[PDB]
Amino acid sequence: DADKIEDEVTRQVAQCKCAKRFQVEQIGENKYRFGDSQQLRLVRILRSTVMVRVGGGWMALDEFLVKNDPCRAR
Amino acid sequence: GHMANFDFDVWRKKYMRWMNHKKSRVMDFFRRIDKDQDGKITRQEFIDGILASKFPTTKLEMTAVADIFDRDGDGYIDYYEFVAALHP
Amino acid sequence: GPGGHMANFDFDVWRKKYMRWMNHKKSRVMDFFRRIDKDQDGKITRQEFIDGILASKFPTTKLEMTAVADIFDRDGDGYIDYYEFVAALHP
Ligand SMILES: [Ca+2]
Ligand SMILES: [Ca+2]
Ligand SMILES: [Ca+2]
Numbered sequence: 329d330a331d332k333i334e335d336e337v338t339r340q341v342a343q344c345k346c347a348k349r350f351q352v353e354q355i356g357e358n359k360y361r362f363g364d365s366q367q368l369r370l371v372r373i374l375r376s377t378v379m380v381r382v383g384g385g386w387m388a389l390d391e392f393l394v395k396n397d398p399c400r401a402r
Numbered sequence: 403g404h405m406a407n408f409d410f411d412v413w414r415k416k417y418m419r420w421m422n423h424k425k426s427r428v429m430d431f432f433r434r435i436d437k438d439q440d441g442k443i444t445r446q447e448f449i450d451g452i453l454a455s456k457f458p459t460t461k462l463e464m465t466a467v468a469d470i471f472d473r474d475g476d477g478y479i480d481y482y483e484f485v486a487a488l489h490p
Numbered sequence: 491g492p493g494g495h496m497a498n499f500d501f502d503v504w505r506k507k508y509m510r511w512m513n514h515k516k517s518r519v520m521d522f523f524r525r526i527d528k529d530q531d532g533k534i535t536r537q538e539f540i541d542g543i544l545a546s547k548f549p550t551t552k553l554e555m556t557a558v559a560d561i562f563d564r565d566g567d568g569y570i571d572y573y574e575f576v577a578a579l580h581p
């Protein structure tokens with residue numbers, strides 16, 4: 329199991345409205361690179377929601393994308 | 403706001419070995435802690451229960467295990483969550 | 491399960507505890523890290539970090555240390571570099 333991560337990710341990154349649609353690459357089962365150019369980030373699953381590793385701890389995937397995907401970054 | 407991969411298999415194996423070797427059944431423990439007899443105990447009642455039994459463990463560990471037990475996250479550890487956590 | 495359950499851990503509590511300990515024990519966290527870092531490349535494995543702490547007689551637990559080491563290691567490279575160290579201890 330644990331493919332719920334790669335399911336949730338691809339399902340939520342599909343929501344991108346950019347011309348160059350937001351790119352995400354899977355390096356490991358729990359490691360992803362997000363964005364036009366970027367760094368390696370951890371991705372785990374807590375209960376139902378996906379969690380990405382950020383400075384102060386962990387961030388919900390939707391909030392992460394909201395902050396890093398420009399087509400949602402108000 | 404921090405979260406980590408907690409070694410729950412080790413805590414769990416350690417706990418069941420403790421209970422089994424201490425002549426105790428985990429459901430006597432749950433029912434004992436469940437005073438209102440409705441099949442639920444708060445994360446805190448559960449933690450206080452474990453620490454009260456003086457099983458070797460710490461509060462820092464117990465917030466993590468109580469988090470893992472509460473599989474729905476509604477704040478309460480019910481009977482089925484309890485069993486599922488201890489008996490996969 | 492066999493590789494850890496994602497769960498809430500009061501890391502702030504732990505690090506504060508450790509900081510109080512080291513600080514009023516006349517010990518620098520830097521010197522600790524350098525002591526553990528034998529090869530002097532700026533990073534120490536999770537296991538070397540855990541062993542270093544448990545040996546230091548800081549009141550903690552191995553089970554706590556697996557989680558703590560997970561947090562210190564912000565990426566999943568299996569090492570704790572000095573930046574991860576200092577940043578974790580001084581947000
Ligand atoms: Ca109850
Ligand atoms: Ca529950
Ligand atoms: Ca080294």
Ligand SMILES: [Ca+2]
Nearest residue numbers: 563567569570
């Ligand atoms: Ca690292």
Ligand SMILES: [Zn+2]
Nearest residue numbers: 344345346399
């Ligand atoms: Zn976009």
Ligand SMILES: [Zn+2]
Nearest residue numbers: 410411491492
């Ligand atoms: Zn498990």
